[PDB]
Design a protein around this motif. Sequence first.
Motif, short mmCIF file in Angstrom:
data_model
loop_
_atom_site.label_atom_id
_atom_site.label_comp_id
_atom_site.label_asym_id
_atom_site.label_seq_id
_atom_site.Cartn_x
_atom_site.Cartn_y
_atom_site.Cartn_z
N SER A 53 1.01 -0.86 -0.17
CA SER A 53 0.30 0.04 0.07
C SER A 53 0.63 1.13 -0.04
N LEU A 54 0.32 2.47 -0.30
CA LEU A 54 1.30 3.32 -0.58
C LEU A 54 0.41 5.13 -0.14
N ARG A 55 -0.79 5.26 -0.21
CA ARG A 55 -1.47 6.31 -0.60
C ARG A 55 -3.13 6.16 0.41
N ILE A 56 -3.59 6.82 0.88
CA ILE A 56 -5.26 6.69 0.88
C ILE A 56 -5.70 8.13 0.19
N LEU A 57 -6.77 7.99 -0.51
CA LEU A 57 -6.77 9.18 -0.65
C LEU A 57 -8.33 9.80 -0.88
N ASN A 58 -8.78 10.95 -0.13
CA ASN A 58 -10.65 11.17 -0.82
C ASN A 58 -10.67 11.60 -1.68
N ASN A 59 -11.83 11.18 -2.86
CA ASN A 59 -11.41 11.30 -4.52
C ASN A 59 -13.11 12.48 -4.62
N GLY A 60 -13.21 13.12 -3.43
CA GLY A 60 -15.27 13.57 -3.04
C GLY A 60 -16.11 12.72 -3.53
N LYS A 164 -10.38 14.16 5.32
CA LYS A 164 -12.21 14.39 5.36
C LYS A 164 -12.29 15.04 4.47
N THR A 165 -11.71 16.18 3.48
CA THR A 165 -12.00 16.57 2.63
C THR A 165 -12.01 16.47 1.49
N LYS A 166 -12.42 16.36 0.08
CA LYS A 166 -12.18 16.16 -1.54
C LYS A 166 -10.76 16.87 -2.14
N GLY A 167 -9.69 15.50 -2.45
CA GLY A 167 -8.63 16.10 -2.68
C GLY A 167 -6.98 16.08 -1.94
N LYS A 168 -7.73 15.39 -0.39
CA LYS A 168 -6.95 15.74 0.15
C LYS A 168 -6.26 13.82 0.41
N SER A 169 -4.75 14.13 0.81
CA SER A 169 -4.35 12.47 0.28
C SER A 169 -3.53 12.51 1.81
N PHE A 227 -17.90 15.25 1.07
CA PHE A 227 -17.83 15.40 -0.02
C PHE A 227 -17.62 15.92 -0.33
N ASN A 228 -17.59 17.31 0.16
CA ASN A 228 -17.05 18.81 -0.38
C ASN A 228 -15.55 18.60 -0.32
N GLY A 229 -14.63 19.74 -1.09
CA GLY A 229 -12.90 20.54 -0.76
C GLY A 229 -13.92 20.96 0.86
N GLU A 230 -12.32 21.33 0.96
CA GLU A 230 -11.83 22.44 1.93
C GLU A 230 -12.00 23.68 2.09
N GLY A 231 -13.04 24.05 3.12
CA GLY A 231 -13.68 25.44 3.56
C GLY A 231 -15.16 25.61 2.52
#
Length: 257
Positions: A53-60, A164-169, A227-231
Motif C-alpha cells: 500500500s502507498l497512499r489513501i485519497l479522498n476523491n470526493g 476529511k475533504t475532497k482532494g486530500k491524501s 464529499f466537499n473540498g476544504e473550506g
Amino acid sequence: HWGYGKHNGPEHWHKDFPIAKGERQSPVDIDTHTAKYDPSLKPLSVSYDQATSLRILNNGHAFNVEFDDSQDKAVLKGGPLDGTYRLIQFHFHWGSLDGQGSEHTVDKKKYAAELHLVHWNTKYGDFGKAVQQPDGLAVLGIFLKVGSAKPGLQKVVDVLDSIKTKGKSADFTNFDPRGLLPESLDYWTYPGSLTTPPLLECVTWIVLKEPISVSSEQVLKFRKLNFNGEGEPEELMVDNWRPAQPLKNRQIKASFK
Ligand SMILES: NS(=O)(=O)c1ccc(CNC(=O)COc2ccc3ccc(=O)oc3c2)cc1
Ligand SMILES: [Zn+2]
C-alpha cells in the motif's frame, strides 16, 4: 458533475453516461435461491502477502487505499477468472444508517457497507486499457455488518481525520489487506460493470457470502468524511452507493452448495 445527491445522483447518471441503462450494469440483487451452484468454479486464490500500500485519497465520492501495481505483488486468480489480476486499490460504499449502504443486496437485504478490492487483468498491460475490455477487471466485494470491531480496519479508520475533504491524501504504507477478509471465501459471481461513472462493462464481480463485522464506532468514523473540498459547505460523505440494477440476461453462479 455526478454524485449522490438529489440533483446529481444515480437516477441522473444516464444523461452523461448512457451505458447506465446497459445490459450488464452493477450492482444487482443476489437472489440466493436462484443462483445456481457451479461445480466447475474453482476456489478463489487471494495472494496478498506481498501487497504494497502507498497512499489513501479522498476523491470526493469515497476514499481509496492505493497499492503499488507496477509488479505482480498482490494478485487475485482462480475462481471464475482466467489469468492474473493485480490489486490496484480498495474502497468502500456505506450508508447514513446501518440499515443501508451496500451496493449489492442479498435477497433484497442491504448491509451497512461494502468493501470493493479492485484488480485489473495483467494481459492488458495497464488499468486504463483493462477497463476497455469485457474481462478487464475483477472486483472482490465484501459486505460489512455492524457488531464487533474489525481489528484490521482500525488503521484505516484512524487516518480518515487527515483526509476529511475532497482532494486530500495521506501516506498509507504497510497496510495489510488480508486483515479485511472473512474466514470463508465462498462467493457468488456474475459479469457486470463499474458502479460509478463511467459505468464501464468490464468487471467480473466476485461477491463473498460471509460478511465481515465492524463496530458502530468504526462505521461512524466513515460517516464523518466529507464529499466537499476544504473550506466549502460541509456535506457528509454518506450514502455513496448505487442501488441494484436490472439483472437482464445474466446468471449469478455460486461457488458453494
Ligand atoms: N465501485 S467499483 O465498481 O468497484 C469501481 C469503480 C470505478 C473504478 C475506476 N475509476 C474510473 O475508471 C473513472 O474514470 C474516469 C471518470 C471520469 C472522468 C471525467 C473526465 C475525464 O477526462 O476522465 C475521467 C475518467 C474502479 C472500481
Ligand atoms: Zn465500489
